[PDB]
Design a protein around this nucleic acid. Sequence first.
RNA 1: GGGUUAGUCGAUCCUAAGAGAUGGGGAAGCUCCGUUUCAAAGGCCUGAUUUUAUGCAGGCCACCAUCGAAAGGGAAUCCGGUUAAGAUUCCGGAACCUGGAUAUGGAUUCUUCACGGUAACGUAACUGAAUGUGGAGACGUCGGCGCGAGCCCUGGGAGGAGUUAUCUUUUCUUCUUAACAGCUUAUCACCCCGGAAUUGGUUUAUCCGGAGAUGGGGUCUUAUGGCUGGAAGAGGCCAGCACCUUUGCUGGCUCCGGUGCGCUUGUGACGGCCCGUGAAAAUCCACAGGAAGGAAUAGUUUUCAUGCCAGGUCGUACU
Lengths: 71, 101, 77, 155
Amino acid sequence: AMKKVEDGNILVFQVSMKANKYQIKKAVKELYEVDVLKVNTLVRPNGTKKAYVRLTADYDALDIANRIGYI
Amino acid sequence: AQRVTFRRRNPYNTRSNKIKVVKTPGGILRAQHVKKLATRPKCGDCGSALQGISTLRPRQYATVSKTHKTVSRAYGGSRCANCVKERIIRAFLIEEQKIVK
Amino acid sequence: AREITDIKQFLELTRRADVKTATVKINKKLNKAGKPFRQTKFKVRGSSSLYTLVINDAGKAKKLIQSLPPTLKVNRL
Amino acid sequence: QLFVCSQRYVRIYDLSQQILVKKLLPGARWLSKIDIHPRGDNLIASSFDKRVLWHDLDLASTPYKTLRYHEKAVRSVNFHKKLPLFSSAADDGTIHVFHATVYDDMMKNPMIVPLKKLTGHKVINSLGVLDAIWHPREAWLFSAGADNTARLWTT
RNA sequence: GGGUUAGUCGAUCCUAAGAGAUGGGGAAGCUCCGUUUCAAAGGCCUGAUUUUAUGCAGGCCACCAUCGAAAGGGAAUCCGGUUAAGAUUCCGGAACCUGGAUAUGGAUUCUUCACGGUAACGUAACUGAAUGUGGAGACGUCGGCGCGAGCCCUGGGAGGAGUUAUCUUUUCUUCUUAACAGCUUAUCACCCCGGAAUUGGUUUAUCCGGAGAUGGGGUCUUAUGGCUGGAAGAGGCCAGCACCUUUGCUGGCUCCGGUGCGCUUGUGACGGCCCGUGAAAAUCCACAGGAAGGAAUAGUUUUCAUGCCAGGUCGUACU
């Protein structure tokens, strides 16, 4: 998931199961003040929902990764 | 010598599920699924294909402009032209015969 | 992708104000089968489609690079 | 290049490449004539529906400017080969003379200014001026009339 | 322990044989019959409905729940890269589809709802409600004949690999181009001119012509092919440097052709066969009709162009 930040410009979050692409796109934009290009999702084998969230070319995925904590 | 798969999960040769073998920029053969062929629109009277109308699938007519689907004569989109000719001749003579009655 | 022949039409697309970036490209090719010549390709990133302009002569190519606006981003090769 | 004017369109062919390179859309049903600006990047077209269209060939395929200075069908449009002048001639028996400055290198579109309405030709059977042509050097225009005359227009 | 990422691949939607609530009717009863039937089975337009002065009036339309296909029907995505294990779903670039807001450009209008062509029909556009009619969806199998693709076969040149006791200008291998877009292209068919026995045209297959052949000139479909854009920046084949490194870094070449009762497959126009003549529905478009609505100081066109926003749920590993 470190690899997808630099190459992809992609944040990887864990999400609630009841969430969908629209809610993940809305909630990332609300908290961190970032424009989302697209969201993909998959349910993990352990049963949580992983969410790959690519941002636009303007807003850097690297900078938000410092601000959040995990880096 | 090089051999080729179905891309999609249907493994049977149905009317929908057809293949063309294509040489790529990678330099290997690959399947490409061809969509089913558009028939011509017909003239609903004489029963033949009618000119200046595009051959598309029925949904695909919604994308395309008006001048593709129509021709400029009255009854142009839906008539043979020769069968439009007849009914203008017929309408005129029978209407004239009605005064003679 | 969409080729353009005309030179006037290309200058309108640069001033259209959705076009964030352009890119210039240079290719070695051989005319007829006599001698080499240095082709150019001025591509411009529209929102829907990629408009492009093939100029064969090297003299007209160098004036065209200057004739681009400065505010537009340009990217070589 | 060869420019071919149909009733509705102007198509420009490259005779060397043997291909169509541009199709102009004047928006008329009855084009009558074209002329090409001497520096090669602009065209004017006359129409029987009373319009003259100026096309800036690099700018857009539709007309840059629509000129409405005639009461009747326009039969001829003609550029001067050296001076920044052009004319339209119509079945109203009138010739209209225009100035046009073209900016070859810089990002400015043509400046077109009407100059003069030339009257004198007699209208015969709904026909007026049938043809016209500029002198190659002088600001002199020659016109051909349905009235059996040709005429020289001068400063 | 890790691993399965989709507006575009499926499911979902449509109907098939069939299944099955409701209204009803049988049955002591578990329930059985029946499926548009002996049902008050909803949803659209107009209204100072012109007086009763603070209460709904006048009309229009006509069949029927739902389930039933991961092979039938059906909006739309391709190339290249990448992982210990994933990809038409990730990354990079390049596309398209559906629905919705509107705003500039063009077009059209003072003859308000485009012009051109004898005609087949043409173009970047070029209002349109009720209702009605038409087409697409939409379909057997066999036979040869034409056209295309992929493969096979084959020559020159530029690289690489092997053989070399003797012979071999030798043997093998690389030299590729996606969806999508814009131009252009074909049998059939159609139009105009003209008037055919001294009968002519013509398929491998003998059918066609005064209901207008032969001939000459056109118009149309775009399966398919071609040309440029996509796109060489990609990929492939080679060469050489840096070096404990989990490492980069830089050069070239990527070209021009040919053959066919060839093989596989797609498609075209025909022919044979039947006391067999070889699904339906969703969905989309067109045509007839003209309710009405729009300008001369600024409107009408979002079926022309460009631009803005959005695309949920579940399956996706492997045999």
